[PDB]
Structures are given as structure tokens and as C-alpha cells.
Amino acid sequence: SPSNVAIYGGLCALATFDRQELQRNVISSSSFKLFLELEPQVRDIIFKFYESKYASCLKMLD
Amino acid sequence: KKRFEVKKWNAVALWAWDIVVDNCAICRNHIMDLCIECQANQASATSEECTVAWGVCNHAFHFHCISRWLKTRQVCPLDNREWEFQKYGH
Amino acid sequence: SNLTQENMPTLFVESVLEVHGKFVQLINTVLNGDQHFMSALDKALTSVVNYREPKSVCKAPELLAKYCDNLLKKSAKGMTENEVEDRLTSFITVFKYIDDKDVFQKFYARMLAKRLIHGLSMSMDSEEAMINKLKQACGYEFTSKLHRMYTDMSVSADLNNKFNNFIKNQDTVIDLGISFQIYVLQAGAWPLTQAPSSTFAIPQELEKSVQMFELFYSQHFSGRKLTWLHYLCTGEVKMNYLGKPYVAMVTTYQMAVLLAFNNSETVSYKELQDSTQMNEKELTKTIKSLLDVKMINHDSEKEDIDAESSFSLNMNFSSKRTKFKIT
Amino acid sequence: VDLENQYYNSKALKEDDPKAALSSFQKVLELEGEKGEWGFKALKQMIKINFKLTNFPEMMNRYKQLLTYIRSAVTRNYSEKSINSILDYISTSKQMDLLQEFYETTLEALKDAKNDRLWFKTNTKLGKLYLEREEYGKLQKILRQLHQSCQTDDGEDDLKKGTQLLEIYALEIQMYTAQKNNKKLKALYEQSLHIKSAIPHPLIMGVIRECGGKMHLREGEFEKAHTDFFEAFKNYDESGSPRRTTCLKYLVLANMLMKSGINPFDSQEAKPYKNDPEILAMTNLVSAYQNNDITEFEKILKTNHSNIMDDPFIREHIEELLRNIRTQVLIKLIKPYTRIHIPFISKELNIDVADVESLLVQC
Amino acid sequence: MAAAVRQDLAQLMNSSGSHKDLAGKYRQILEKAIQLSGAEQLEALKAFVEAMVNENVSLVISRQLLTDFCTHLPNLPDSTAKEIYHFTLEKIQPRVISFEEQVASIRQHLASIYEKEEDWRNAAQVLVGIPLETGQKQYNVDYKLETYLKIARLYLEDDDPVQAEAYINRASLLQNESTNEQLQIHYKVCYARVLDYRRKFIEAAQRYNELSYKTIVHESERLEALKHALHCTILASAGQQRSRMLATLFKDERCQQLAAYGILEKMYLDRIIRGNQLQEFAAMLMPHQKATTADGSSILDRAVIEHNLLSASKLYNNITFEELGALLEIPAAKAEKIASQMITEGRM
């Protein structure tokens, strides 16, 4: 389903890449922006990981 | 003798602030034409009516040419005079 | 070399189209339109207009600008939409061979500004199609000065429609002759700039109308002094001495001379220098054009141009139509 | 002759009437001037009266005689100035119930040799009116006729001003931006590249470039967004309000994101217009970014609130601009002091200690 | 008497036959209005202005009549000629493009009235509206040079160096046609003083030094130009460009003739700056070189503190913040902010 590719690719790159690599891969590319816009709960994870907000990024994961 | 009658006649509407444009001083185009830094960028600069950046010596040039000159030297060592911005915009 | 430097504006275009037309088909048919032979034809044709036998290299861009003036000339009527539209298509092909694009831009700028002020604009479509062909060939940067001159004339055209509606709002001692001819000029886009003329006196008939234009233009722009150009602006006159009231669009310089004839039948050269209120160098070229025509005729047997010679007024003038252009 | 049409038209303009003056300008048309600009100006005054009052059957009768003389009878200079003037005046007083019938009868009288601007401009306004009527039959018929040519704006290389395929896509961009739908704005930007390769430089060309700068600003390319916003401000300056003030805020926003914004105005299209309080709000925003001071940046948002807070596009980027200023001040203060205190930088910046610990980690 | 004046002017409005016959009868009417006094003189002189702005009278007759009319106006007292200049400029305002030569003649005498009444800002705005650059008639060189010289002189007395040096650049274009070499020297000297008013002693030290090595400059002006460059070097902040300017003035033998040799010697050898050295140098400075710079009442109060911090970086090992402020008579809160700004800029 198109609602699962954003989670499959969003959770895999979150464990192998840091904060600088996320802004250039899942953010700079316009192809992955259309998949992240459907589910707003996945786009806020990348923004919270770059602003050093590990307190609110962990509660939304569980 | 002859019949002279006019309804609503007019000539032209000319305007030139301060002195007359003398093809700038760094090139040959007019004060509102594409000089060198205006036609080579065709993206971050203008393409139709160019801008007019005046100064303190009552001599206007181009905003794209005066910004790169004041970046390394604010004063003008060509004749030891005052060089500053005055009256923005024609 | 068959015409040396006395080439005609209508013959130079047909001479290039006949030579290139006979070679653009021999390659596309026999050689199947090879790219190697097509580049050699365009490269060799560029050196013909640039390096020729007669010593007249600057006459190539001048003849190109003169050809556009004949197609845009407005003598009295107009032209069809078939011959003018077909002649503009073959004009962009000849311009690709002349590499002197800087000389053609200076000649076309002073010619287009003269055709608009004098009122010689015959077809508006000829000006829109001309700036569009130069942009597709040269570029938007080279045609930027020509696009600003065309857009400035369109703004004055929209203002004429708003001033024409003011006649229906309490106006009965204004309607007399021609309507507005507003030509908004600039300093960088237009070649003409605000320069001091020759302190003209301005005839008494042109005192009105123009006085109201200075107050109307002062409302759109907060403080804007305008200067008139008596070298390109022309007026009109009405002669009721012949069998038909003919109207001849004469220059504004001749209106001050004809206004001095209302006091006496003849005006000497000493009185004409004070009525015009200008130098004697400009009055010499003005009285010269009035003597060759039937407007100002000499007396006695053979009277030349002197400081003590008089200048009578002739009622018979060579006319045939109404509002005929002299340029 | 041209003599009888001058004295009759001069006396008729004196104290005009909404009904009595229409009979004076009708008898002058039977003489047929030989100029023949005397007969063309007489019919132009009748159109400027029939479109204000009277009705619509009498207006269409006088409009057909104006489109007749356009060839060798009347010069095309004075004829083209009347077509572009009436078409821009009847679109305000007359509603859509009488404007659609005036465009169908106009195409039947413009099938001469010159079929460039007379056919493209008359067909452009027809496509914009079919979207409001929700008509799908007539919209597809006018699209197949324009597809036979090479370009939708110029048949070959003559007159311009007349694009329908790009005007429909441009009208959807101004509507989809209010609903915040980036999935449709990205698809419309790719379809505008095919039309851009066949049009000169009119006004619609500057509308499709505005959507390109908004899409690149959301992805993170601040350099690509500045090239599209600057090229669109030149075309929008010719039109004016209200499509000119809203485009100025997007041009200065992309300049401050490139580190930094030392150029508040790079053109004369917005320098003398800063006297208005709505435009001056954008001028003071760039001044607070050049000197690098967070105390003056927050004062602009409190003073000017009914111009910068009402737009959701610039509101989503107001937080990143405030964080970039704190980074520049920390560099100019950490060089002299070797072991500087944490509450020391919080007192100089006049900010709380809650955001200092979060900013030091990202820096 | 004013009733018969307006009746005679309206009769000759549409009358035209000759150039000397029309101007001869009109001169007799204006002559009678001058001999009148009381309230009849103001009503007769104002009727002549309305008779010339009409389209019936020729512009040649109106221009010749207005030329001699502006000559007898200064003969009238200031209590009467003031109301005429304000009323005549409003009638010719719609036709300012026709009588351009007559507008400048009225504004030339109106500016002289405000000059005698001690008004520099009011007299300068009158000559500004004169169409000198945006006019249809160009005057002579002596007429434009005198007008531009009066505008810069009136704006200078009103404490406005910006507006005074703005209109002086227009007169420099016509100064090249003359042979006055003394006027060209003052053209660059006055511009160098404006650059120093923006607290730019570093950049101003190079302009005054280069102008002293020229040949067209007089010998009496080259020594005065070197004194301004020596004062600007001391008032400038301590940095990399200050050390290069102090060594250039020490190598020149022209600095030995000036009385400020002790200040240059104490600043080049990295000597100490006591409280008696800054007071002696401030007495020889120009009045426009001392401004309220936090402490004290001169600009030198800031250059001394910045100079002592640079010399202490190579001589003093490590001093506390409380001891560094007591040696300079400055608080501890000021000795830390100044020393921190020198490290960031890369000058200490």
C-alpha cells in the first residue's frame, strides 16, 4: 500500500543515518516528499530529530 | 488670415532627474539599459527596466556594479573623494 | 558591385532573397539537406554583407532600417494584411547574415521614435511582430530596449481612452480639431532625453490644450517637469482660400512663421527673427523649406534669401488630400 | 469626403447626450471618410456609451460595424488601439451572461489574412469563462483547434498576447495554494515546461515561475527559489496591485535564507514604493537580518502583525530565520572568551535559558 | 486710479499690429503703475501679471515686458516686493514651461530678500526650484556658477554639510573650462572633510596623505594637509592599518616642522599615554573633531584606550580586570567590552 512505503523507508534511514544525512536524502529529494506528506506523523520525526528534540521524538515513536 | 483651431493638442512627456545620462561611466549602455552585470546573470538581476542607484556625488550607475565595488573598498581611491549611498532609486 | 553604394531599400532585400533562395533548394534536394553544406552557406553569406567590394560597410544596417520605414509609412491610407505579413517573414532571414547588430539597434531606435511622434505609424501589428522576431533570433537581452519602447506607447494609448471620455462630462468649448497624441518618453529606454531646446516662443494657438496637459500629468507623478520637442512634433493648419478646405500637417516651427502674417501681408527677415524668438541658424533652415514650396513666395523677379529681403504669403498651396504627412 | 465628417463630429461632441447624441454619430458613417480615421473615431464614442446603459441588442449592432473597417480603409494603428480598449472595458460592467455571446460573434468577423492576435486574444478569454460555467463540451472543442498549430501563443513569429493552455493551469495554481496541496502543484509545474519552450515573454510566463519558487523553498534549495522569484517580480510589476505586493514578500524571504540578506532591494521596482506601511514592513525585516540582532527582529513581528502573520507561507519559515541570527552572534563572542559561561550568552542575547541549551547542541 | 489701469490693459489684449507699436503702448501703462502709491500701486502691479499670462497677448511681447518689470521690483521696499513675488509665481505656475527665463529672474530677487533677513534655509530652497538642469533654456557659465556657489554657501551656514556638498558637484563640470587652479584644490579638500565626519579616521588618513604628494597643490596647503592626516592617524582605532600609517609619517621629514612631533613619537615607539598627553593633543584639534564618545568630551578618549590595549599585548604579561581599569581611569565594565571587540576583529 502507498501508506506503508513512507514508514518502511522512514524507519530504516532513521537508524543508519544521522541528522545531516536526513536533510539531504529524505528532505532534499522531491520524490520522497510526496510520500511523507500523506502521513504527517512521519514528517515530524525528521524535524524533531534535527532540532535536538529527543524528548518529544521518543514519545511519538511508541 | 488662415484658420487656426485645436481641440486637445500636446507634445511629449520627457523627464530626467538631476543631470543627464551620459552612458554611465563603466560601459556604453544607458542608465536604464542592460550593462554588464545585468545581462550576464539573467536570473538574479533585471532584464527589462534596469534599476538606478544614485550616490553622494550625484552620479548614478548600477546597483549590481556598485555593490561589488564597495565590498572590498567602501571609499573611492581613484580621486580621494567622498563615496556613499544617497537617494535610493529613477 | 552592380549598384556600388547607391543600393535601394526595396532592391537590397530582393537581391539577397534571390541569391539565397536559389541555393536553399539546390542543397535540400540534391544534397538531401546535408548539415555540412548548410553551415558553409550561412558562414560564407555572413562575410558578403560584412566584407564587400564597395567601401560602404555601414550602409548594410542602414538599408535594413530604411526597409522597415517604407512598410510602416503612413502617407494617407493603409495597406493590406497579406503583402505586409508576407514581407516580414522574409526579413528575419536576411538579418541573420548581418553581424552588425549594434549598428542596427542605434538606427532603429531613432527611426521608431520618429515614426511615433510624427504620427507616421500605419499598422500597430508591424511593431508587435518586429520585436517578437528579434527576441526569437537574438534574444531577450538585445530586444529589451525595443520592448520597453513598445510598452510605453501602449500606456499612453490607454490614457487617451480615459481622456476621451471626459468630453461627455461638461465640455462644450473644447472640441475643435484633432484629439490627444500623448507620447510618453523616457531617459534610458528612449534615445531622446530632457535637453534644452532653443527657447522657442510657441504660437498663440498652441497655448491652450498643452497648458492643461502639464496639470494633468502632474497628478500621476508628484512633481514632473516636461519639456517639448519642436523637432519631431507636428501640428496642422486649415486653408480656406482654395476650392476645397485642405488640411496639411505642417511642423510646429512653421506655425510661428505663419502667425506673423496676421498683422501684415509681408514679413521681412528682421521681423521674423523676433517673432520666432530663436537664433538665426535655426531660422535659416526653416525659411529654406518654406521657400521651395508654395507657402512663402518671393517678390520682384528673382529674390534670394537675404537679411533685408521680404517674405510674402501665398494662399495657393500644393494639396490634394486632408491631413497629409510631409515626412 | 473627410470635410463633412469633421464639422459634424465637432458639433456633436459639444454637450453629449445618452440618447440624442447617438443619432448625430450615425449619419456621419454613411458618408464614408476617405482618410478614413474620421469615421472610425465616430463609432468609438458610440461603444463607450452603449456599454454603460441602454441594453445589449443595440450594442451588438454598433459593434459589428467597428470590426468591418480594419484593412485598407482604416489604418491598423488606430484600429488595433480600439480593439484592445473595448475588450478591456466590457469585462467589468457586463457580467458573464452577456460576455460569452459577444465573443462567439467576434470570431466570425476576424477570419481575414491576419489571424494572430485577433484569434488568440478572443479565444483566451473564452477559456477562462468556461471554468466558471462548468462546461466540458465547449472547453474540449476550443482546445483541439489550438493544438493544430505549433505554438499556442504564436502561429509562426508574429503577434503575441494569447495563451489558453497555460492560462488554465495558471488559474489552478492560485487556487490550490490557498488549500495547501503540494501534490497537485508539483504536477502542474512539470506541465508548464513544455509550454514555456514555445512562448515568448508575456505575462502568463511570470505566473508559472512563482509556483516553482515555492516548491523549491520547501525542499531546502534556497538558491533555486531566488532565481524563480526574481524572474517573476519583473512580470508582476507591470500589472500592479494586488498581485505585486504579495510577490514582494516571497522575494525577500529567499534572500535572507542564503546567509545572509545584505541586499534588501536589488531592483527599482520596490525602492520608491516603500513609503506605504504595508510595503515598509518588508524593508525593516531585512534591516534586522544584516546587523545580526535578535532584539530588533522580534520587534518587527510585534509592530507589523497584520501583514506578515496572516500569510501561512512565510509563517512556517519565521522560526528558522530567528535561529540563524543567534548562530552569527555566538561566533563573534566565543573567540575572545576561552572558557565562557553558559548564562553569560543568555544575558547578552536577552533570551531565556530554555532555548540556549537546545541551540548549543545544534550549533 | 486702479480702475482705469485694468480698462487700458484689456483693450490692448486682442490688439496686434506691430512689434514696436504694441510694446510701446504697453510700456506707458506699466510706467504709470510705478508712480502710484498706497493701495492703488498693489492693485495696478497685480493686473499686469494677469494680462501677460493670457493666450491673447503674444509671448514675445510678454517676455520683453516681464524682463523690464523685474528690474524696478528691487527698487520697491521689501514690505511690498515680497507679496508680489509670491503672487506672480502662482500665476505663471501653470505656464512655467513658457516663461522659463522669467521664472529664474523672479527667484533670483526673491532669494536676496531672505538673505538680508537672516534666513539660510529659506533662501536656499528658492534657488533650488530654478530649472538649471531640467530646463528648456540654458543660461551662461557665470550665471550657473554664481547660483551653485550661493546654494552651497547657504546650506553650510545652516549646519547641513550633506546638502551643501551635494549641489557643489554640479558646478565642478563647468569649472574645467576656466583656469582657476585654486578652486579645483578646494573641491577635493571639502569632500575629504565629509568623509571624516562619519567617524572613519582610518580611511581618511590615506586620502589626506596622498593629496600632499601632488604637484598642483600649493606649498602652504601640502603642510596643512599633512597635519590633518597626522591627527586622523591618532584618532583612528588601533589595528593593522594604523601601524602602516604611523611608520609612513615618521619616515617623512615634513613632520618635523609641525608642533605635533611629540605625539607621533610617543605613538610609534609604543610608549605610555598619560593624562597630560591626551589633553595637549586635544587642544590643537579642530572643533569638528571632538564629539561625545561615552567618556570625556572628545573622540580621542576612545582611540587612547584602544591604543593602550594593543601595546599591552606585547609588553604586559597578564593583568587583572580591576588593575587594567584603574590605570586608564575607566570602570571594569568598560575595560572588558573594548578588549573583547579587538580580538574578534583580529586586531589584538
Author numbering:
A (entry chain A): 285 to 346
B (entry chain R): 19 to 108
C (entry chain O): 328 to 654
D (entry chain B): 30 to 392
E (entry chain D): 1 to 348
Which sentences did the original study use to describe this structure?
The CRL2 E3 ligase consists of a Cullin 2 (CUL2) scaffold in association with a catalytic RING-box protein (RBX1), with the substrate adaptors Elongin B (ELOB) and C (ELOC) at its N-terminal. Activation of CRL2, in common with other members of the CRL family, involves a cascade of E1, E2 and E3 enzymes, which conjugate the ubiquitin-like protein NEDD8 (N8) to residue K689 on the CUL2 scaffold. CSN5 is responsible for the deneddylase activity of the CSN.
To study the molecular interactions between neddylated CRL2 (CRL2~N8) and the CSN, we performed single-particle cryo-EM to resolve a structure of the assembled CSN–CRL2~N8 (referred to as the holocomplex). The H138A mutation in the catalytic site of CSN5 subunit makes it possible to assemble CSN–CRL2~N8 complexes in which NEDD8 remains covalently attached over the time scale of the  experiment. In each of our CSN–CRL2 structures, the clamping motion of CSN2 and CSN4 is a swinging rotation about hinges located close to the CSN2 and CSN4 winged helix domains. In the case of CSN4 the movement is coupled to the detachment of CSN4 from the Ins-2 loop of CSN6 by ~30 Å and leads to an ~12 Å shift in CSN5. Only minor conformational changes were found in the CSN1, CSN3, CSN7B or CSN8 subunits. In our EM maps and the other published CSN–CRL structures, the exact position of NEDD8 and the CUL2 Winged-Helix B (WHB) domain were difficult to determine.
